[model samples]
Target: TAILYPFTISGNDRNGNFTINFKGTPNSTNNGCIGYSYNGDWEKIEWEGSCDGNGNLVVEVPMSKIPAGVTSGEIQIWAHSGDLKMTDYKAL
Candidate 1:
């Protein structure tokens, strides 16, 4: 599937705490969130106790969870499918 641009996540560091906000037009279908770090591994971040379908979503990752000395990372978000699989990502 094709994703449109102006799709972005901006990182803000305040007193050693970081907040990342994802801003984008929703995917065509199944919308869900995925998060990853420097290790190239990916994990699904839960939304609404299930997958949030089609729209804007904000995901927060605490500074404590991140590995030390890591300045930036990436996140993958997908259109949520129960049995069918489709995924995508953005790095900042």
Candidate 2:
């Protein structure tokens, strides 16, 4: 059985930046979700930095960071902390 199930993100700006906020640590090893386009193709983005030990783990991403012509991308929040979890990551 999956302790921490994957969640879904409704939708984000196809050309705009967005932020993902987690209230607490994950219960399982793969507790996050991956972003995709209409055909379920993976998107691309960038990782800025993590707000560690500062109340909450906040991931800050910018649209400009992505490659030109590339609008948005998908994201995968690690189910577990440490390796699974990352301070930041590129969407691509």
Candidate 3:
């Protein structure tokens, strides 16, 4: 069992979008979810997909479903196996 680390990503309240890059096996399959925290409360979104041939999965979150005033969030992923990396985050 490979232990995984947590990640911090940025989301746009304007465009209502959040994006990130995750690492995995090339063309490997996996499933996971997105979680966000607002007012000390937290929630999750159902997400699952396979990584591209480049061994990367790009996740773009729709913040509209998450409650407003969220100051933080993280991606909890568990693939066929699972250091998750997060980058190219922005809030516009």
Candidate 4:
């Protein structure tokens, strides 16, 4: 089962930047990724970054890459090199 964290949708910017701010913990050997679903399909962003020691991550997705008319979706994170350990998720 996936754990979901709910967040407020911050409007995107004119520069094709869709920013999502969330809090989670990730170690040096692990990282996080952001994705969303629209029209019944889920698309994962190409960018990935490590968690800021304090369990905070700001993911910026290009507006052009995201599906249009997206109002709510899910965000998922995982620890690389492991067997589904430390994997987490959120809904926005």
Candidate 5:
């Protein structure tokens, strides 16, 4: 099963200058990805080197990439071999 974690943001603009920090243990056998969606749009933030033993991934979204007027969204992490894994979003 997959878990969806919801988050809210305020006063952020469409400049897309933001950072996301994810921490969690991934399925040991396969690679994983971290992404987020808002306003009916989904964007992948991290893929390469995301499945490390330490379970830490950092991503930066450029100004042009963020959705305009996004006030809330969900951070998702998925494994390639099985059900979704545990993940935590920290800071912005």
Candidate 6:
């Protein structure tokens, strides 16, 4: 059985372009969120997708949207309980 832990990753380009890689349960659908600040102005976007067979989900943000460079930001992923087999759930 797989261990269930909420985890994720991200990176930025030379000029602060960003990419988010969300790790989730295999073959599961998830809700994604990306929030960032450009020139100190905050913004956020929502997305939905299923993890790949390898359990990876990705989201990219271009510099065009953050020309002033990424001041700060956050990205996240999740699914409702029971909607996905995130872990062993139970073992007998």
Best by lDDT: 3
What does candidate 5 score on TM? 0.49
- Kindly list the per-residue Cα lDDT of model 2 for residues 4-83, writing each as its tens digit: 22323324333444455544433322344434344445553433333345434555455444345333444665344433
For candidate 3, the TM-score is: 0.67
Q: How do the residues 1-92 of candidate 6 rate in per-residue lDDT, one tens digit apiece?
A: 22233323223433433555555667776765566655557676665777688876565555455434454455544453224333211100
In terms of TM-score, how similar is model 2 to the real structure?
0.36
Best by TM-score: 3
Q: Each model's TM-score, in the order given? A: 0.35, 0.36, 0.67, 0.48, 0.49, 0.53
On TM-score, the stronger of 3 and 5 is: 3
* Count of residue pairs whose backbone atoms collide, per candidate: 2, 5, 0, 1, 1, 0
| Residue pairs in candidate 2 whose N, alpha carbon or C atoms collide under 3 angstroms | 29-79, 31-79, 35-74, 44-73, 45-91
- Residue 52's C-alpha lDDT in candidate 1? 39
Determine which window of 10 residues in candidate 3 has minimal summed lDDT: 1-10
lDDT of 4 by residue, 8-68 (tens): 3433522446565645554333344556676687766654555566655566766666555
Runs of candidate 1 exceeding 4 Å displacement: 1-18, 23-56, 80-92
> Comparing candidate 3 with candidate 6, which one achieves the higher lDDT?
3
Q: What's model 5's overall lDDT?
A: 0.49
Q: How many backbone clashes does candidate 4 have?
A: 1
The residue-by-residue lDDT of candidate 1 on 1-92, one tens digit each, is 52222222334332332333444445423444334344565434432213235544444444455554344444434443332222332332
lDDT of 5 by residue, 1-92 (tens): 44455656553555444555555555233333344566576766544334356655554556455455666665554443433344444334
Whose lDDT is higher: candidate 4's or candidate 5's? Answer: 4
